[PDB]
A paper describes a structure:
Here, we show that AGE crosslinking is harnessed to activate an antibacterial phospholipase effector protein deployed by the type VI secretion system of Enterobacter cloacae. Endogenous methylglyoxal reacts with a specific arginine-lysine pair to tether the N- and C-terminal α-helices of the phospholipase domain. Substitutions at these positions abrogate both crosslinking and toxic phospholipase activity, but in vitro enzyme function can be restored with an engineered disulfide that covalently links the N- and C-termini. Thus, AGE crosslinking serves as a bona fide post-translation modification to stabilize phospholipase structure.
Residue numbers in the entry:
A (entry chain A): 169 to 398, 426 to 472
B (entry chain I): 2 to 230
Write the structure that this text describes.
Amino acid sequence: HTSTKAERWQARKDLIAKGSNSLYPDAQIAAKRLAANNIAVEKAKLAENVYKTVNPLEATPGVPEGWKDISNDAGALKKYGLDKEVLFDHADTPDFLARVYQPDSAVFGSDMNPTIVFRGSRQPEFFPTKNMADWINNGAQGLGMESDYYKRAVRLGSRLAKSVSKIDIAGHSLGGGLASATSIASGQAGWTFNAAGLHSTTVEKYGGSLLGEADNIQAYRVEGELLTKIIMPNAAGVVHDLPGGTGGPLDRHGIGQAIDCIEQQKDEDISIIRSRA
Amino acid sequence: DLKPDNYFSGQQLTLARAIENGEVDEVIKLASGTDLNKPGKEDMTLLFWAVMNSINNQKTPERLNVITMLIKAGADPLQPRPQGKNSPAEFVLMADNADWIKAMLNAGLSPNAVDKTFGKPIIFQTLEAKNTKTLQAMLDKGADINITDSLGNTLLIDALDFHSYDHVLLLLERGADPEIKADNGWTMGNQLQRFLDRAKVGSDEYKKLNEIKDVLIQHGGKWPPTPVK
């Protein structure tokens, strides 16, 4: 059999409230962390979904239940000062790409916020060492083109600082680095997962937009994962360490392990709340 | 380092070879009869091929004129590539030198043209260039300096959000209207005040933001900004 996401969301809410109304300190602490991880794992599933975008002008398949991709709905995007064009780079295949998702009020009520989610490149490259048998790379080099995903991410941050509607930022890996830039620049709350940190040259380049703050970024990371295991700054925000990873640093970097590890922690806090019934 | 046979065959390949060789008169002869806009392999078009053959050592008057003559013959500088990838005109607006966009403007490309995928004025793509030369070229040809995107943003507003500070300064110097509000009621000045409040006093970025403020005031713009309604 099955169950609707709305029923499951409500049941989790009820379980959280049981812990938060408990007389036992450990149930109360567990309820707070469970409430945070309930939100975080939704952001993490969106951060996983952005890797599935192929044609950015088309639907992204597999959008997590209770969410809708509005990346091609200009009428919905303009609520946040966004349009379709600013969501990805256009010179070449879009390694830098954002998707914007709106939560279903029938599922989450008012508990969830719209979220813009970033994907970065799978293999960062210093531009002069790219394969120049690829004509677009040849052309970008010969035309003196600037190569900087952080410029478009900071630009989105400047815009989202003006949004009258709340919108959260999220990303995994290099997309979590981009997400943290957009979050610091905009003031919006951010969620990152095994994220890259912000290099000093990047922070300097974009000045006060990348300065301070970070208090409203939740930087989730699988213990043992590649990036923290490593001029490599720490991910910005409040660190949320996650035990329960498997394999080596490369395996633990994957967004699937981040999602699984958050679910492991939820199970753990649920068991604590249930133990005080 | 590139070979035209990897992208074209038949009549298009013969034109691609004349472009490869920089033969302006042969290009003019073949272009009136060849399919100019049908893409070849790897999304290459004959117009992108001409751009590719006018860079580095080959950025010559004649090879730049090959771009002009292809467009006069019907090559579309605003033709998109698939999946939202950009057109030759948008592509060369991101360059650090205006020679390529000028070649296109010389064939009648409108400086107020909008792109065929998103409908956004292509001049907004200059804001990602390393310097202001492509923006200068579009303004010199008569682009509307106060043209807006679909959300009411001007180049002045978008350039500051982009942290494209030299583009901001050039736009002010050329008389861009600083009091225009986007759809959300913000002016460029509203963001400039916010940036100044967040900058580190005495940093290079603080000096640059204050240079913008000084130039804004010099060109008659209101400072401090009215709060957003």
